[PDB]
């Protein structure tokens, strides 16, 4: 999910740039720059809702899922071998040869966790005026504009990858928080004509176990997956518009049930359940400076 | 902290090249190079002041901190995918296409230690005239002009990383002193159009232990972190003024306490009294 949304199902009205961004148009001055939401590649995410497990209140011990390992794979590289088509040709003087295939800055990140990816805001030029609706920008989270410290690192510009297809990759990067329940891997390769490189195999896995052999335990009961795989951009036989390209990523997660100790008192979370279920109301002041409570008496016998 | 300082906060007066070097202006003649203070990318350093541990100044033993391992990561790689904006475009004959991303010479160094990084001076050109105010140069420390031995190793041009954002990286390199309390890692990749390469992960660490299994003992009581992360330069849609980009680096250090022998010799005090 990067740029064109999947909704215009027809291959003529949406042109079916599905899987591609719409078109990168540059800026007209240093201060005027609007990235046009359907251009920006964004984070893909999903949540699998696992069932509830057993418990043992005699020992205050619980059971919860635990992602033990993962096999990932970016599917569809051979697709980049389609060298016909109406892209910029290699021999441009006569418009002959080969349609220049997908090349350029690539970005492969994935993340498997027991709770949504915690990410950070960090941008290039901070005068950039992102559309204030339909995309989640640093202005959307902290309700003020961007500053210069959002150009290097601002410990205030944090967020959770909660929705989907809305957090542009160019703004929100996986954040190394203090105590984390998520394993994220990633790699970047800049340039303008860097040849894309990819690898498949259905043999090698990834271990998600911690230093203590604990792995991502699933908060709530949901297992969260996240990814972005930008493979480059293509050039049209026109003004060199530069639709991005991205490929789907396949996850195979291997989980098991682990016994954990419930670290909270039962009365505390009972009270919390009652406070969350009940409405939060107003009413007449029964506490403070204008208490309407007149007297209170406490007897014993 | 590479060039443009963080201080002028407005995005119009400073243009906010915060995180970017200011501009690059080549020399006009061979003998006259005087680059700038806000053009040179410099070292970043910080000192965490850890608490005081023990009061066993009657037995030789004494305990102090010890960095056991580090988890580092340059955060902000994906931000280099901003290919709108006013940089030199991919296709220049019509001025259309893609505002070229950040490329060029890149330089990643970091260092975790118990005392400030010991640096060594080595310059490409010993005739460059760095401004003597606001930046530390081989002249600022040797008090004389630069010698031709400063284009290669000169055992005199040595310094430490006292300040921050003051020691440029075109001059001061991590020095392999014979007895060292600091672990520094680094890699450099030259070129004029080299594509950047980076790696996220929160999985594996670096072990700072020595061959004897000691690791940086925080003398004084401080832990010194140093870093430089140059990703390349962006070329503007004008006179092709490049200026560097740098990304922040996140450190996570695992410290434990260790019993050592007393480094505070009372003889020094009871001799300064004489």
């Amino acid at each position, epitope marked *: 999910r990067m740029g064109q949304p999947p909704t215009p199902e027809s291959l003529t009205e949406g042109g079916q740039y599905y899987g591609w961004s719409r078109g990168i148009n540059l800026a007209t001055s240093d201060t005027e720059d609007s990235p*046009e939401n359907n251009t920006l590649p964004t984070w893909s995410m999903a949540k699998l809702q696992l069932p509830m497990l057993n418990e043992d209140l005699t020992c205050d011990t619980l059971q919860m899922w635990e992602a033990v390992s993962v096999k990932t794979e970016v599917v569809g590289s051979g697709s980049l071998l389609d060298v016909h088509g109406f892209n910029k040709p290699t021999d441009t003087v006569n418009t002959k040869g080969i349609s220049t295939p997908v090349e350029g800055s690539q970005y492969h990140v994935f993340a498997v966790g027991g709770e949504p990816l915690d990410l950070q805001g960090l941008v290039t030029d901070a005068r950039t005026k992102y559309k204030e609706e339909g995309v989640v920008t640093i202005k959307t989270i902290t309700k003020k504009d961007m500053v210069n410290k959002d150009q290097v690192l601002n410990p205030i510009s944090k967020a959770k990858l909660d929705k989907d297809g809305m957090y542009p990759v160019e703004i929100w990067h996986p954040d190394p928080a203090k105590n984390e329940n998520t394993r994220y891997f990633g790699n970047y390769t800049g340039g303008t004509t860097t040849p894309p490189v990819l690898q498949f195999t259905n043999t090698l896995t990834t271990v998600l176990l911690d230093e203590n052999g604990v792995g991502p335990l699933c908060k709530g009961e949901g297992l969260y997956l996240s990814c972005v795989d930008i493979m480059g951009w293509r050039v049209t036989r*026109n003004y060199d518009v530069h639709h991005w390209r991205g490929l789907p990523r396949y996850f195979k997660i291997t989980l098991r049930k682990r016994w954990v100790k419930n670290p909270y008192p039962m009365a505390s979370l009972i009270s919390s359940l009652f406070n969350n279920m009940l409405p939060q109301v107003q009413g007449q002041p029964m506490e403070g400076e204008n208490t309407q409570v007149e007297e209170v008496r406490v007897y014993d016998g | 902290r590479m060039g443009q300082p963080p201080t002028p906060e407005s995005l119009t007066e400073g243009g906010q090249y915060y995180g970017w070097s200011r501009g690059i202006n080549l020399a006009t003649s061979d003998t006259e190079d005087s680059p700038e203070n806000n053009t040179l990318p410099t070292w970043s350093m910080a000192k965490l002041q850890l608490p005081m541990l023990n009061e066993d100044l009657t037995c030789d033993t004494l305990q102090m901190w010890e960095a056991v391992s580090v988890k580092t990561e340059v955060v902000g790689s994906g931000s280099l995918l901003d290919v709108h904006g006013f940089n030199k475009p991919t296709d220049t004959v019509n001025t259309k296409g893609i505002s070229t991303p950040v490329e060029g010479s890149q330089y990643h160094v970091f260092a975790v230690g118990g005392e400030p990084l010991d640096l060594q001076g080595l310059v490409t050109d010993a005739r460059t005239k760095y401004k003597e105010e606001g930046v530390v140069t081989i002249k600022t420390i040797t008090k004389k002009d630069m010698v031709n031995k400063d284009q290669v190793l000169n055992p005199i041009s040595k310094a430490k990383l006292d300040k921050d954002g003051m020691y440029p990286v075109e001059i001061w390199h991590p020095d392999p002193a014979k007895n060292e309390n600091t672990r520094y890692f680094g890699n450099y990749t030259g070129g004029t159009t080299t594509p950047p390469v980076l790696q996220f992960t929160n999985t594996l660490t670096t072990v700072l232990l020595d061959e004897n299994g000691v690791g940086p003992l925080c003398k004084g009581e401080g832990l010194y972190l140093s870093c430089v992360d140059i990703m390349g330069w962006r070329v503007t849609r004008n006179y092709d003024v490049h200026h560097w980009r740098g990304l922040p680096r996140y450190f996570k250090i695992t410290l434990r306490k260790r019993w050592v022998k007393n480094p505070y010799p009372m003889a020094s005090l009871i001799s300064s009294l004489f």
Partner: antibody
Amino acid sequence: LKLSCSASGFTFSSYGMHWIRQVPGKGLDWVAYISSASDTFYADAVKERFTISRDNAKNTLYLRLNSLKSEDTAIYYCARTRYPTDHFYDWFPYWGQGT
Amino acid sequence: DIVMTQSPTSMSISVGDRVTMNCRASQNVYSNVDWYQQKTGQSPKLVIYKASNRYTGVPDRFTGSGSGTYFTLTITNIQTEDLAVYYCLQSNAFPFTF
């Protein structure tokens, strides 16, 4: 208060279409623009009042007029760009009939 | 907004003569300037697109030149079918101005 501009003979949704109005005496005046990936760009004087839209599979742009309509009067044209790109600046050569 | 100013407000000239009309833009427009011919009672026809090329069907007497802040449209030998108004349009930022 709602215009309509029918086009035929091409793929309607692959091109960007401008609106240009001409009062008989002061010349032409650009109004709005909507590209393939529908995103509306307006003139400075008419920002909040008009709304340019396009209904794909029906092949007609709708410049919903000012909804106030007080002091804006001219011959309203249509224009289609030359090439089927997502490039905003494409020198529309195919003007409408006028209304 | 960019303001396009044209030096000749009105030029009176016979057939066979030469005319040159210039255009100036407040800010820099690199090469994105079109030249439109409007005959009274017709939709404005494109003549010189992108300030350096001739749209198809347009004769060789028409010439567009210049780049940046100063553009020009030139006609070497006028014809009877060249008796129309001529507007220069910047298409380099939003909003477009005529």
